[PDB]
Design a protein around this ligand. Structure first.
Ligand SMILES: C[S@@+](CC[C@H](N)C(=O)[O-])C[C@H]1O[C@@H](n2cnc3c(N)ncnc32)[C@H](O)[C@@H]1O
Ligand SMILES: Nc1nc2c(O)cc(SSc3cc(O)c4nc(N)sc4c3)cc2s1
Ligand SMILES: *Sc1cc(O)c2nc(N)sc2c1
Ligand SMILES: [Ca+2]
Ligand SMILES: [Ca+2]
Ligand SMILES: [Zn+2]
Ligand SMILES: [Zn+2]
Ligand SMILES: [Zn+2]
Length: 223
């Protein structure tokens, strides 16, 4: 629902579970860009910042722009203002309260970081309790983000076959994170969606109610 959760279920960074590892970089393995602190928008979405080209967040100890660096989106957790709302046939969803420009950072897909054994146990539990909402995305061959038991606002974004947001996997201080980014200009009040079918995991598949002209008919089917 759209009520404030118990605080322990709202997490701000990914939460490793059980045997799952997270990784850290030596600062010498982190790319350093050529932007200047005096630039109009140092390391911004229109810049030529090499870190952005590599989908690597600038490290705050390293980047020449320092505190003017605009390529620290994941670490700073400054997200466009959003709100949870009830849809007609797709449960709860997420909509922006502010205009968002094409390519802008919308949110990080934050959740519990689990391995495949744990993910199987959670899907089997969902099967036994008739749970029909899933919040799992593949991070890599060993790790899955599950924003179901804990997460942030991104867990409420619904699926669309012709969405207005996309996932991008970035490197942040030596480990991978999933960011959501606008595919186009989005007006305030618009529901935020992405295409689940590239990376999602769940209990089988379910009929898609996105209603897009190109609708492929299902959530849960690799294209
Ligand atoms: C990541 S959650 C999104 C938030 C969810 N609607 C809720 O109320 O908590 C994904 C779940 O939302 C539902 N959903 C999202 N997009 C849908 C769509 N296009 N068609 C049908 N169900 C959808 C499915 O039940 C899916 O398991
Ligand atoms: N009035 C309101 N305040 C808040 C707020 O402060 C934070 C969020 S964000 S995160 C969240 C929300 C859930 O409902 C949830 N449920 C799980 N099982 S995990 C999880 C994570 C939503 C609302 S709505
Ligand atoms: S991969 C996947 C993603 C979902 O959101 C989902 N929801 C269901 N009811 S099955 C399934 C699979
Ligand atoms: Ca360029
Ligand atoms: Ca594997
Ligand atoms: Zn830069
Ligand atoms: Zn920078
Ligand atoms: Zn669809």
């Amino acid at each position: 629902n759209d009520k404030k959760p118990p605080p322990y279920k709202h997490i701000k960074v990914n939460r490793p579970i059980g045997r799952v590892q997270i990784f850290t970089a030596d600062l010498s393995e982190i790319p350093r860009c050529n932007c200047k602190a005096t630039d109009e928008n140092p390391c911004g979405i229109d810049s030529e910042c090499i870190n952005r080209m590599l989908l690597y967040e600038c490290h705050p100890t390293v980047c020449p722009a320092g505190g003017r660096c605009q390529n620290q989106c994941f670490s700073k957790r400054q997200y466009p203002e959003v709100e949870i709302f009830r849809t007609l046939q797709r449960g709860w969803g997420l909509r922006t309260k502010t205009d968002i420009k094409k390519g802008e950072f919308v949110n990080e897909y934050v959740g519990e970081l689990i391995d495949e054994e744990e993910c199987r146990a959670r899907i089997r539990y969902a099967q036994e309790h008739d749970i029909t909402n899933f919040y799992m995305l593949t991070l890599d061959k060993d790790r899955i983000i599950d924003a179901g038991p804990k997460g942030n606002y991104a867990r409420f974004m619904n699926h669309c076959c012709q969405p207005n947001c996309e996932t991008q996997k970035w490197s942040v201080n030596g480990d991978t994170r999933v960011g959501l980014f606008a595919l186009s200009d989005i007006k305030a009040g618009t529901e935020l969606t992405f295409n689940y079918n590239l990376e999602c995991l769940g209990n089988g598949k379910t009929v898609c109610k996105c209603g897009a002209p190109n609708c492929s008919g299902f959530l849960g089917v690799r294209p």
